[PDB]
Amino acid sequence: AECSVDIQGNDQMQFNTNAITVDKSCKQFTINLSHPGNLPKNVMGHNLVLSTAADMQGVVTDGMASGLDKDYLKPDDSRVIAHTKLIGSGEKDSITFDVSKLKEGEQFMFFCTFPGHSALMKGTLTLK
């Protein structure tokens, strides 16, 4: 199966998918994030961050408090499974992670931790 997806985050706080499926036969999986907006990352920065459903808002909350200098992620946050960098207008970033870090049956989420964004910028990730 394929083991990559391309996702965009825009100037109206939206990702271009609501749900990511990872094929259970993948060993690694790569997420190619890009920002087709025009706004700087200072006001419209996006990352794509993975965690369990339960852990998402703790990551978001602690992340908000951590500043642009830390990509709006609390340092050494063990709840984060994998993530891109935080990017602004016209940038792109890709991450490849071990799919062994995910498990069938488990409800994962992807989201952006930039202050305020998660309200809209989130979706499910499922190993299937």
Residue number with CB closer to Cu ion (9 or 81)? 9
Query: Is 46 annotated as belonging to a binding site?
Result: yes
Residue number with CB closer to Cu ion (3 or 64)? 64
Tell me, by CB under 5 A, how many residues bind Cu ion. Answer: 4
Report the 10 Å Cβ neighbour count for 71.
Answer: 19
CA quadruple 48, 60, 37, 39: dihedral, nearest 10: -140
Q: 50: helix, coil or strand?
A: strand
- Rounded Cα distance between 86 and 110, Å, is 14
Query: Is 117 annotated as belonging to a binding site?
Result: yes
Using CB under 5 A as the binding rule, whether residue 15 contacts Cu ion is answered as: no
Among residue numbers 82 through 121, which ones bind Cu ion (CB under 5 A)?
Answer: 112, 114, 117
Residues 6+ apart with CB under 8 A from 75: 66
Residue number with CB closer to Cu ion (113 or 127)? 113
Contact flags string 44-73 toward Cu ion, x per CB under 5 A: --x---------------------------
- Tell me the C-alpha to C-alpha distance, in Å, between residue 70 and each of 19, 75, 113: 26, 7, 11
Residue number with CB closer to Cu ion (5 or 39)? 39
Provide the CA 8 distance to its chain's centre, in angstroms.
Answer: 11
Q: Which residues are annotated as a binding site for Cu cation?
A: 46, 112, 117, 121
Give me the residues that bind Cu ion (CB under 5 A), please: 46, 112, 114, 117
